[PDB]
Design a protein around this nucleic acid. Sequence first.
RNA 1: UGGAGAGUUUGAUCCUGGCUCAGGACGAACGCUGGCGGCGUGCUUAACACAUGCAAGUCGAACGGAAAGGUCUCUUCGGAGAUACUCGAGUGGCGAACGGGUGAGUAACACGUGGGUGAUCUGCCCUGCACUUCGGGAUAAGCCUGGGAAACUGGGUCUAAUACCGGAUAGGACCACGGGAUGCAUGUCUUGUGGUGGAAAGCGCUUUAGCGGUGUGGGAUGAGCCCGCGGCCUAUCAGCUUGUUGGUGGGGUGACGGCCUACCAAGGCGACGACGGGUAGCCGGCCUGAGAGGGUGUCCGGCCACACUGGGACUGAGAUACGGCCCAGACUCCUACGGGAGGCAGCAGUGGGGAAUAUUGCACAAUGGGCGCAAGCCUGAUGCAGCGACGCCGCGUG
RNA 2: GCUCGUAGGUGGUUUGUCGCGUUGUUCGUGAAAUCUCACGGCUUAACUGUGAGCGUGCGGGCGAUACGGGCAGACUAGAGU
Lengths: 121, 93, 91, 82
Amino acid sequence: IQQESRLKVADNTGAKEILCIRVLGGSSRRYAGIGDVIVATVKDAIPGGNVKRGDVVKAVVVRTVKERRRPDGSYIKFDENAAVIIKPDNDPRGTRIFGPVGRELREKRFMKIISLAPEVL
Amino acid sequence: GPKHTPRTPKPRGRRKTRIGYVVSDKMQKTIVVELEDRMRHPLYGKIIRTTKKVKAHDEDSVAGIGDRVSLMETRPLSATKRWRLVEILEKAK
Amino acid sequence: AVKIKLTRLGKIRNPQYRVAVADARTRRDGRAIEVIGRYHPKEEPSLIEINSERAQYWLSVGAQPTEPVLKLLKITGDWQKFKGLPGAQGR
Amino acid sequence: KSQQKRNRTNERARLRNKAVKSSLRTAVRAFREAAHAGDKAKAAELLASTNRKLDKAASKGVIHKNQAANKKSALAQALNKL
RNA sequence: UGGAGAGUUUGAUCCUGGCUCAGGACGAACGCUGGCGGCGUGCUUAACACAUGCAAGUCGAACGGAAAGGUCUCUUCGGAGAUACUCGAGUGGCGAACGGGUGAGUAACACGUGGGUGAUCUGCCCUGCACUUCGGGAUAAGCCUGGGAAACUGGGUCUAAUACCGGAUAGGACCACGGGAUGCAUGUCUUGUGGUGGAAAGCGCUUUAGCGGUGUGGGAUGAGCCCGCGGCCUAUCAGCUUGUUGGUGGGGUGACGGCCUACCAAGGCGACGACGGGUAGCCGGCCUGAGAGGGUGUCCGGCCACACUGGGACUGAGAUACGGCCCAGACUCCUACGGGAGGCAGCAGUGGGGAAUAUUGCACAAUGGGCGCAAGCCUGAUGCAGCGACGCCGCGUG
RNA sequence: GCUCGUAGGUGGUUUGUCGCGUUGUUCGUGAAAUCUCACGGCUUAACUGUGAGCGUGCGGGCGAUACGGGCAGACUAGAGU
Ligand SMILES: [Mg+2]
Ligand SMILES: [Mg+2]
Ligand SMILES: [Mg+2]
Ligand SMILES: [Mg+2]
Ligand SMILES: [Mg+2]
Ligand SMILES: [Mg+2]
Ligand SMILES: [Mg+2]
Ligand SMILES: [Mg+2]
Ligand SMILES: [Mg+2]
Ligand SMILES: [Mg+2]
Ligand SMILES: [Mg+2]
Ligand SMILES: [Mg+2]
Ligand SMILES: [Mg+2]
Ligand SMILES: [Mg+2]
Ligand SMILES: [Mg+2]
Ligand SMILES: [Mg+2]
Ligand SMILES: [Mg+2]
Ligand SMILES: [Mg+2]
Ligand SMILES: [Mg+2]
Ligand SMILES: [Mg+2]
Ligand SMILES: [Mg+2]
Ligand SMILES: [Mg+2]
Ligand SMILES: [Mg+2]
Ligand SMILES: [Mg+2]
Ligand SMILES: [Mg+2]
Ligand SMILES: [Mg+2]
Ligand SMILES: [Mg+2]
Ligand SMILES: [Mg+2]
Ligand SMILES: [Mg+2]
Ligand SMILES: [Mg+2]
Ligand SMILES: [Mg+2]
Ligand SMILES: [Mg+2]
Ligand SMILES: [Mg+2]
Ligand SMILES: [Mg+2]
Ligand SMILES: [Mg+2]
Ligand SMILES: [Mg+2]
Ligand SMILES: [Mg+2]
Ligand SMILES: [Mg+2]
Ligand SMILES: [Mg+2]
Ligand SMILES: [Mg+2]
Ligand SMILES: [Mg+2]
Ligand SMILES: [Mg+2]
Ligand SMILES: [Mg+2]
Ligand SMILES: [Mg+2]
Ligand SMILES: [Mg+2]
Ligand SMILES: [Mg+2]
Ligand SMILES: [Mg+2]
């Protein structure tokens, strides 16, 4: 995931698709994986929803098509790139998470999202 | 009764009768008959005439334009048929 | 099953009851099949009124009255007449 | 609620009625395939076997006497017209 | 047996013609004031969401067993004994489809009305004709284990039945052939002939304690289905339909029917308004009006539709199946993250909205309903009580 | 603005038939409460019980053809040639 990438929103804030604007975590950081924070803009939303089109938001990546290594030598790979819109205190703005999430959120300290998720892999 | 009682007599029901002209007959054993009636207006009190349309069963389809027919109403023989042919009176001129 | 039941149609402190024949699966104060009398439990002894022949017909056809209608039928003697018991009147 | 017993009796009824109905269906299709085969010899006894099974089911109450009569008439006319 | 007018155009007049008023009514609210009793009425807005308690259980005179009661029982001196009334739980039977709630949806044979059912079903009720006759296999419960945080569940034994299955015989099951009457065309009601077949169950008894079940005739009751007539606005909605219209052969239904299916015809609906849009539960009823009419569907009564939203099946005589089940969605909650539970448009009550509408009360004393042979049990139906001048009536404040 | 004309509404005199409209009687139905007459009971009324009206209608049978109407005819006045 880099700038101009589009992701599917995995919560119920009303936004459907967001476009990555900046990968936070340092100057000229290139790729955002699972557990990384993203500044993004809402490119689509449910009509008459809480979040509108064009709002600049902050989100955390929870699913990636690209497979990611784990310290024990195993890998995990999803079928889509998905993110969750969060508050400044790392809590999701939505009330529930759709679909599974990666276990790296535990080590990135996203306990609220981890608890809300249907499944952690 | 040392055996089964057959039944008690009852008066059989009487079905309505109407007379009308045959309007459409190309129906493959069915005919379409126009019926008319008069009902007094609820408010103005004038007598007015209204024409209806019913579908009548014709086992042997012999009826043309006109062909006045008296109809007696039956069970639901079809989806939209509730009448059967009784007899042909005052054939088409 | 057909039952003969008391129907109350009085005011709050005047519980007047009507001896009526009604279906069992109906409310108490409902449209009975046929009313065959009444009963006022506010006179000195009581006020009892029974047709005594429509009740007989219903009893012979299968109608089954409740406990108070049964007591009233026994009082009026129509139940005794239907069942063949000797005393046809005990008012 | 005291309806768990009702639910258990219900499911017992589903299994019983479904089994008898499926057996009756199999007998009916056996008679039907005999009818199209047109042996006209073992179909005569298959008709009686199907009638016995179907009115036994009707007596058991799993079906109605009207349905039993309809099916028996249908299978009889089926044997008849060939 | 019941019909009021007044003001207001002008320098003054008569018409036409608007606008306003005097009257009544309400499931009412507000302002002020405020004693009581009789009877009624009280979420009209958010079919918005709900903490909590009660709203459907019963039968030991169907059955296996004994958790408790008093118990004769051995006796522990605090433990024993189903054989005994009695009965936890369990099998089985019935009820649970009634009763209670809302008016959301619905312009519809939903409702009111009158016909048809030769197109029909129908437990418990009544009652005519007869039976109530033989065998088999497992299981609940209990016991021994296992899994799961729970919700729940597996393996092994084990005991019945008015539980289940298999039997002998029984015409309103069928087929073919006929007789006898009927018309309203398919037909209708009853016997005969030959070929087919279809159930029952036992239990209790102070010895006339009583209950039962089925094979079917006929009533009573409830309901399924069709038809004519009547009850909104809109054409700045003019063309609608293809299982649609009909027929044939099958399938399906308790029952007729494109209800479903395969084939054939091209038909069916529309200016008397289809199709489309807006609105709405219908009626008996209620208000006003001399009446015709205009408004309205609240108490109550009849019906219909719905039960968080949407869809579906089963049991059963009978299911929108509120307090039954399966699935999809949203919401709420528990969790060990693997998984589970839930629906006050029942009574009472809470949160929120609104100008605004009530107790988490009593009792089955009477009526109705359900379970037995009963005695008896349940019933927020019901009978009441509590709050409000909320409405009618009546009496006082001499 | 005028005219024509589709459906529709409406229609001269006279005869016969039907009796659909019309009208009469009878039967069934038109639930109860509530609306009214007359009574009865809460000290009265409100409230409630009873008898009769209401339920304007509908279905069935049995009477009439005076008018409208269906059918079968006839006339010339309408109208047309
Ligand atoms: Mg046909
Ligand atoms: Mg098979
Ligand atoms: Mg059939
Ligand atoms: Mg004036
Ligand atoms: Mg002047
Ligand atoms: Mg002037
Ligand atoms: Mg004038
Ligand atoms: Mg039980
Ligand atoms: Mg017990
Ligand atoms: Mg019983
Ligand atoms: Mg039941
Ligand atoms: Mg119910
Ligand atoms: Mg409401
Ligand atoms: Mg509604
Ligand atoms: Mg109707
Ligand atoms: Mg076992
Ligand atoms: Mg036999
Ligand atoms: Mg048996
Ligand atoms: Mg087809
Ligand atoms: Mg067909
Ligand atoms: Mg509505
Ligand atoms: Mg006037
Ligand atoms: Mg619904
Ligand atoms: Mg709710
Ligand atoms: Mg639903
Ligand atoms: Mg049942
Ligand atoms: Mg069933
Ligand atoms: Mg449902
Ligand atoms: Mg229920
Ligand atoms: Mg509920
Ligand atoms: Mg409530
Ligand atoms: Mg407010
Ligand atoms: Mg408020
Ligand atoms: Mg009680
Ligand atoms: Mg009682
Ligand atoms: Mg006030
Ligand atoms: Mg002009
Ligand atoms: Mg002009
Ligand atoms: Mg002009
Ligand atoms: Mg013309
Ligand atoms: Mg003309
Ligand atoms: Mg004339
Ligand atoms: Mg004319
Ligand atoms: Mg008095
Ligand atoms: Mg009346
Ligand atoms: Mg008549
Ligand atoms: Mg001339």
